[PDB]
Amino acid sequence: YGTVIGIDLGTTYSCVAVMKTEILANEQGNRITPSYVAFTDDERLIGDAAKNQVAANPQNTIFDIKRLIGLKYNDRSVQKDILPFNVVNKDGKPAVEVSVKGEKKVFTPEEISGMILGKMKQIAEDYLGTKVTHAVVTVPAYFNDAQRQATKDAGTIAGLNVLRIVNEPTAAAIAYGLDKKEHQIIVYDLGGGTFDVSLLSIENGVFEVQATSGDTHLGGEDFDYKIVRQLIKKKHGIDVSDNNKALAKLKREAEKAKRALSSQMSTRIEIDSFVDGIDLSETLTRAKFEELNLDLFKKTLKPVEKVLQDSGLEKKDVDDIVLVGGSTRIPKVQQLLESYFDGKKASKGINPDEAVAYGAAVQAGVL
After folding, report:
1. Known binding positions for ATP
2. Annotated region Nucleotide-binding (NBD): where?
């Protein structure tokens, strides 16, 4: 098998890890890599390079392909998700259409995910100094056979034998060693684009997914967009709502501002210079960020309630709470979940962006 790697192939960001479990940093030094592929005339871009030029090349930059993987073109979720790039119908399945050198190119979601998985493998190969041939790859619990198989096929495209397809909540629980006296585990997974709640039962090293719920269109980017709207709104006579280049700048800084307010009470948002030649300089309090996103924060507790009643469980029956995703760092999010579980503190120690890949790598090390 060689050295088997663990890969969190996520909606907005991907992550690699190997077994002590280490999270692998990319060529730009980032431990998470954007699930982005861009098609230019000069080269194919994957990860940070692709995301950084999304504004300049919106038609040929693909993202959120995990939303289309393993599904049919006529599916209601696919029709809903169909966005700035052309999605076509290729044999009853959604496929992306890009233009390189004046000719159209059609790629399947397996192929696109295979490019991202290819990047993740290359990072691992530089980390290890050896070839990587085998991987454990994670998917959401609600993924069906077609979506799981499409993820396997994406591995094959990247030259990876995906030995196991593991559920993300399970991988997160594995990372915290909760696999090792029956326990009931709540996994609260607030990612960049999707929100997942799972109840897992762990028996004698055996996990079972007892119930799942959530919101496929509630994530960190939705909390970011609330900051972007604030930066748009007065001091100057310029509305940047139609300026995609300027909007991409705001999204970057709003992402940084949310991360800063998880540790600080205030943050300095500055772009020198934003539009034309004029500076943008705004202060955002944690209180203002909480205020704008309070309805979205409280809405996350509904799927937690649904998970508990779809199982045979009360709040007190929950033995462990695992936090997954960047937005679980937000003190208000933690506060609302803690008081929902009557003061029950969540597990901590692992970066919530890296917890899924961590657990994937742990199971990979056992083969």
Report:
1. 10-13, 66, 192-194, 255-262, 326-329
2. 93-242
At residue 134, φ and ψ (nearest 5 deg) are: -130, 145
Active-site amino acid positions? 8, 66, 168, 189
Q: Whole-angstrom distance between the N-terminal and C-terminal Cα of the chain?
A: 8
Q: Provide DSSP, 97-125.
A: EEEETTEEEEE-HHHHHHHHHHHHHHHHH
As a whole number of angstroms, the distance between CA 205 and CA 141 comes to: 18
Which CATH topology does 219-299 take?
Actin; Chain A, domain 4 (3.90.640)
Strand runs (DSSP E) across 132-234, as ranges? 134-139, 161-167, 183-190, 195-202, 207-215
Topology at the third CATH level for domain 63-115: Defensin A-like (3.30.30)
280 token code pair = 């943008």
Strand 161-167 and strand 134-139: the pairing is: parallel
326 CB-near residues (< 8 Å, 6+ apart): 190, 191, 192, 220, 258, 259, 352, 353
Q: Which residues are annotated as a binding site?
A: 10-13, 66, 192-194, 255-262, 326-329
Q: Does the domain formed by 181-218+300-347 have CATH 3.30.420.40?
A: yes
CA–CA gap between residue 59 and residue 38 (Å, rounded):
9
Q: How far is CA 97 from CA 42, 88, 92, 206, 288, in A?
A: 18, 7, 15, 42, 41
Q: What are phi and psi of 259, to 5 degrees?
A: -65, -40
Q: Which superfamily, per CATH, for 1-62+116-180+348-367?
A: ATPase, nucleotide binding domain (3.30.420.40)
Q: Identify the experimental approach.
A: X-ray
Contacts of 296 (CB under 8 A, 6+ apart): 218, 222, 223, 226
Pure H helices in 158-243: 168-175, 220-232
